[PDB]
């Protein structure tokens, strides 16, 4: 009654086992408001002398 | 024109590793995990004479 039960499958040719679990959560939000204002004017001084 | 933006944002991440190693000489240290508690009763609770 001791736990030195290494009578089968002695793998100590080092055998480094890894694990790498990885989760990720991500939300996002935007609010993009523009507002234009624009006005024009001109003048059209024309002439013709037939 | 004017323009205003509001980029609200959040993240999350939950990593986890479970790396086990198996050096060879740990069983040498594990030979007597129960021996030094079992003879402790011989040291302190039982008549150590014939």
Q: Which chain A residues are Cβ-neighbours of B23 within 8 angstroms?
A: 12, 14
Tell me if chain B has a CB within 8 Å of the CB of A5.
Answer: no
A14, B22 Cβ separation under 8 angstroms: yes
- Identify whether the C-beta of residue A25 lies closer than 8 Å to the C-beta of residue B12: yes
Neighbours of A4 (CB within 10 A): 12
Cα A28 versus chain centre, distance: 9
To the nearest whole angstrom, how far is the Cα of A6 from the nearest Cα of chain B? Answer: 9
Q: Which residue has the tokens 């069983």?
A: B27
Number of neighbours of residue B46 by Cβ within 10 angstroms: 9
C-alpha pair distances (Å), B37 with each of A16, A30, B33, B34, B44: 31, 65, 8, 5, 11
- Provide the 8-state DSSP code for A17: B
User: Which residues are CB-neighbours of A33 under 8 A, at least 6 positions away?
Assistant: B3, B4, B5
Other beta carbons less than 10 A from residue B30's beta carbon: 13
């Amino acid at each position: 009654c001791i736990t030195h039960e290494d009578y089968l499958n002695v793998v100590y040719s080092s055998s480094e086992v890894e694990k790498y679990l990885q989760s990720q959560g991500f939300t996002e939000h935007n609010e993009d408001t523009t507002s234009n204002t624009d006005e024009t004017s001109n003048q059209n001084a024309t002439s013709l002398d037939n | 024109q004017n323009a205003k933006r509001n980029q609200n944002q959040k993240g999350n991440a939950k990593g986890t590793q479970f790396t086990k190693q198996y050096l060879i000489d740990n069983i040498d240290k594990a030979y007597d995990l129960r021996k030094k508690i079992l003879n402790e009763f011989d040291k302190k609770c039982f008549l150590q004479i014939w």
